[PDB]
């Protein structure tokens, strides 16, 4: 039920921004949004949790935002390894993740 | 008496600290006395330091020293909701004396600032 961007891409030096939104049952002002970097069929990676918090070791280039109706994932200064798919979560303190449709990128 | 408040030693730092839920001169005569002196030597080890930081009678005293990120570059949420006082101490144990000295000068200068303030 949680939709994101169809697809985006950029080049080495610029930035992107992956959308993520849904109805009031999933989005947003009353829920926490997390962002995962997930290569298809392999071990994923946490990058952002509860809106704008960066996981340990995550480079300061990754940024998260959340208006009252949608959440974004800004990937400033792209690199070759950032060419993956991306998914967003929608969770509270006592629940489970409601993942997104999917958004892919490239350079 | 109840100096054993270790009850939350395996809990997270923020769950534990932020929101709790006549002798005879023989070998039991000199043993029991040295154990009585050895206890209050150490209670005054810390209560003196607590006095040198402007923290006498305070369990949670805020200071005037910014956090040098070289001590620990970790977030509030990955400290007080993830680590325990036992292991946080070990991670930051090397700079423990630099912060002490620096706490001491922040309070000493704060003592003379109020001295210049109460002179008016």
């Amino acid at each position: 039920v949680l939709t994101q961007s169809a697809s985006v891409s950029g080049s080495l030096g610029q930035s992107v921004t992956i959308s993520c939104t849904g109805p009031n049952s999933v989005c947003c002002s009353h829920k926490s949004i997390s962002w995962y970097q997930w290569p298809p069929g392999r071990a994923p990676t946490l990058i952002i949790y509860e809106d704008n918090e960066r996981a340990p070791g995550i480079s300061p280039r990754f940024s998260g935002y959340k208006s009252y109706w949608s959440a974004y994932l800004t990937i400033s200064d792209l690199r070759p390894e950032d060419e993956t798919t991306y998914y967003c979560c929608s969770y509270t303190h006592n629940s489970g993740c409601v993942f997104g449709t999917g958004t892919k990128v490239s350079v | 008496v109840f100096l054993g408040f270790l009850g939350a030693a395996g809990s997270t730092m923020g769950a534990a600290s932020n929101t709790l839920t006549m002798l005879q001169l023989g070998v039991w005569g000199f043993k029991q006395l040295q154990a009585r002196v050895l206890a209050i030597e150490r209670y005054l080890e810390v209560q003196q330091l607590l006095g040198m930081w402007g923290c006498s009678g305070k369990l949670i005293c805020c200071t005037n020293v910014p956090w040098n990120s070289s001590w620990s570059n970790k977030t509030y949420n990955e400290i007080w909701d993830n680590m325990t006082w036992m292991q946080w101490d070990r991670e930051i144990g090397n700079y423990t004396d630099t912060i002490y000295k620096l706490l001491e000068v922040s309070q000493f200068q704060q003592e003379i600032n109020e001295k210049d303030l109460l002179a008016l």
């Binding site: 926490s32 997390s34 997930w38 298809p40 069929g41 392999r42 071990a43 994923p44 990676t45 946490l46 949790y49 509860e50 918090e53 996981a55 998914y87 979560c89 969770y91 509270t92 303190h93 006592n94 629940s95 489970g96 993740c97 409601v98 993942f99 997104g100 449709t101 999917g102 | 997270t12 923020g14 769950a15 949420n77 990955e78 007080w80 909701d81 993830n82 036992m86 292991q87």
Partner: protein
């Protein structure tokens, strides 16, 4: 640190019920929820459920409510902050729709609002 090594990538046919293991290391197995999440090839990544290796409390999705059995045996102490636990999960009326790679991931923190968030992931197990 920490590493969650999973089970083998063995395949079965519909009507069966397979168990997937998840052997942890390098961290306190009791301190963080274990979390299984399935990546079906013909759907979106679906969250299956976390259990508490300490409280023994579980929470699944309503799509696996009466179809999944998730358990954990006790942890083996290694040092003051290192344990070795094992995580097990099954599926009831299993079909071929449930085909995909299954992951196990430990929780993020042990307090706050992001407690169970699947931070550290495993190796995945191919089904089919």
């Amino acid at each position: 640190q920490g590493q969650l090594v999973q089970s083998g990538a063995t395949t079965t046919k519909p009507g069966s019920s397979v168990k997937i293991s998840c052997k942890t290391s390098g961290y306190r197995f009791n301190f963080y929820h274990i979390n299984w999440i399935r990546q079906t090839a013909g759907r979106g990544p679906e969250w299956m459920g976390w259990i508490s290796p300490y409280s023994g409390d579980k929470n699944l999705a309503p799509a696996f409510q009466d179809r999944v059995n998730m358990t954990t045996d006790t942890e083996v102490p290694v040092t003051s902050f290192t344990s070795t636990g094992a995580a097990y999960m099954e599926i009831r009326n299993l079909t071929s729709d449930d085909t995909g790679t299954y992951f196990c991931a430990k929780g993020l923190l042990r307090d706050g609002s992001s407690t169970w968030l699947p931070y550290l992931w495993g190796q995945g197990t191919l089904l089919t």
